[PDB]
Design a protein around this ligand. Structure first.
Ligand code: HEM
Length: 153
């Protein structure tokens, strides 16, 4: 709907399971990115000039771990305040994405790689409600990001 408390619980819950195996889950996210849009590889500094996604890279792990953390925090924020607040960081994030060649048409790619990751993290605990909670948070965070991008360009 607009993030109920049982929806926020599920995001936090699946988020903690994700965090439990960063090496594994973060490698798996970039696999799902590249399965969707193989052309995206080149945008990523730690993937460029590599054949396969690295499995024990600290840069990949740090990046993909931050990404998930910000969707999960966006979802708590929506639950609690009703909105996503734009701060310096999301302003900062807009200029970096503009610097790296990210367009609005790229957002659906990372959104589906994140849904598929989480589905594999929770396994049998997956529900259509968890799915809609991550969807809402991602979508609300991208809208903020996208305008900070559109203001940087
Ligand atoms: C809400 C959705 C997204 C979130 C929360 C987000 C978050 C981030 C963050 C936190 C970083 C590192 C920022 C820094 O400290 O420099 C970053 C970098 C990056 N992101 Fe995203 N991102 C999102 C969507 C996307 C999309 C759709 C793409 C395009 C395929 C993308 C591509 C990149 C690239 C190319 C970098 C630079 C990382 C590097 O090359 O080292 N992002 N993103």
């Amino acid at each position: 709907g607009a993030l109920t408390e049982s929806q926020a619980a599920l995001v936090k819950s699946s988020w903690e399971e994700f965090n439990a195996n960063i090496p594994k889950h973060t490698h798996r996210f970039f696999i799902l990115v590249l399965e969707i849009a193989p052309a995206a590889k080149d945008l990523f500094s730690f993937l460029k000039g590599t054949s396969e996604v690295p499995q024990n890279n600290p840069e990949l792990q740090a990046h993909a771990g931050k990404v998930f953390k910000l969707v999960y925090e966006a979802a708590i924020q929506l639950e609690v305040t009703g909105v996503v607040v734009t701060d310096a960081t999301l302003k900062n994030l807009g200029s970096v994405h503009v610097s790296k060649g990210v367009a609005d048409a790229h957002f659906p790619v990372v959104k589906e790689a994140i849904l598929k990751t989480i589905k594999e993290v929770v396994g049998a605990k997956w529900s259509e409600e968890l799915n809609s909670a991550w969807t809402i948070a991602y979508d609300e965070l991208a809208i903020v990001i996208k305008k900070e991008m559109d203001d940087a360009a």
